[PDB]
Amino acid sequence: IPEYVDWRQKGAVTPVKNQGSCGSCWAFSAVVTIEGIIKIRTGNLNEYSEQELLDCDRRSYGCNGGYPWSALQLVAQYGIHYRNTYPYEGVQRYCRSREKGPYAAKTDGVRQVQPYNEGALLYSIANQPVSVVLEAAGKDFQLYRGGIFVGPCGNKVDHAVAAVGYGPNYILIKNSWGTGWGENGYIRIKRGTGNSYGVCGLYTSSFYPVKN
Template sequence: MHPILHPATNRPPTLPFQASTMASPRHLLKLSGALLLLCVGVCVARNSDFSIVGYSEEDLSSNDRLVELFEKWLAKHQKAYASFEEKLHKFEVFKDNLKHIDKINREVTSYWLGLNEFADLTNDEFKAAYLGLNAAPARRGSSRSFRYEDVSASDLPKSVDWRKKGAVTEVKNQGQCGSCWAFSTVAAVEGINAIVTGNLTALSEQELIDCSVDGNSGCNGGLMDYAFSYIASSGGLHTEEAYPYLMEEGSCGDAKKAESEAVTISGFEDVPANDEQALIKALAHQPVSVAIEASGRHFQFYSGGVFDGPCGAQLDHGVAAVGYGSDKGKGHDYIIVRNSWGAEWGEKGYIRMKRGTSNGEGLCGINKMASYPTKDK
């Protein structure tokens, strides 16, 4: 356990935050030039391995410690800026985000925030770079059927975690490409393929970005149902190894696709909208593509715990639900969600989102637009 976490709760420290302790750009300029220029160009490696929480009480004790914290954060995330002026601007953003993170960590008990790789981005910059769901008014399920409709609630297991059942690949990172819809789709297809065949195979998000163009817009957003439709009608989806991720749009690579066998699906179905019980029924049988609102600062800096923070239901991000369970100690029921922002975000790339809310749309709209692929044996 990292020393800045409280042993009893595994939570970040609660810190008294004073804006006056933050170094201004004017003061920053007066500090050692060597210190300031460490990460203008090539970042200097540090021995300190910061946790995703990213700060301690001592880090806010002086201007020098705050600057040092910023430099360590830059080194950890290999950040480099084009100019000294840009670095000063990013330091101001970093300070504002740290103030927000510390404030929430003192006020909230069910989850906590951390200085992750997004700590030098304003919320507007974050939203522009890392979301990408195009929520269409019409849905395109292969039929109106919901195959899990007749499953009795009493027959559902108390908890399910498809990671432990070998149906979830390692967490991936979409980078600054609005391709969340492709990652959500692929996670669900990888899951049902593993369940049916016993083979867990990493599949290609890049193929969807390049080739699934009916209703989708590559790095400018898309929708999981359209991607499922492409996979079902085009002969399947190829492996990530044969068709690797580029973090940008490319041309549809027929030559790449010919180099490997495709994983097929039979079709896909939509989970009845705004019905959490239906989502849990589906999730008990396979990973499910879901859409959420992920644009808030709480979500941007989520680091751990059962998230019940402020968010609306304006869907802007595609993710994959890969299980559900309960935090017995605090009585929180949750859905396990795999994100596509890398393993350093959240709980090693995952977030536990509270379920059982009074709102039919679910927390952050998670019940509004869920769907899953089908695969015949």
């Protein structure tokens, strides 16, 4: 695999979003990976619906948190609507998929990256954007404004984001806190520290959609 990957440069990443006060990061994370895999497979970059996952995933807890895996499983079983058909409201409502017409895209499955393994995560990122988790509760992460981040942070993962690339000493992450956080909404997290958890627990739990 190559030294640099950046799915933004391949036209496979949509603009940065803001989840607001709602604990919907799990849905934002899953949607980034859907937007990426559909571009890779079909050639078209579209925005898909975080709100639909928020409303419709009965394995997750709405604005009180949830699971990237179950969001991706839902898209493989049913499908997902475009974002403008089912836009983000920042509050859980009833599932409105049926009344909003046919789904816009559908995947075939979900796979996990081998956990606690930097090379396995880089290999997966080289193929497509990946949903990853990290510990975001610390003030250092909250206040990050740029540079290659090394903490301070622990491994108590609590926030789902998307890995959209990497370089020699970092992994490139799209966050859902708006463009005013980090590097236009992104963070470069240091890699190569030898800590099997990853910086801020980044290697704890990573998933990606499968589409034939």
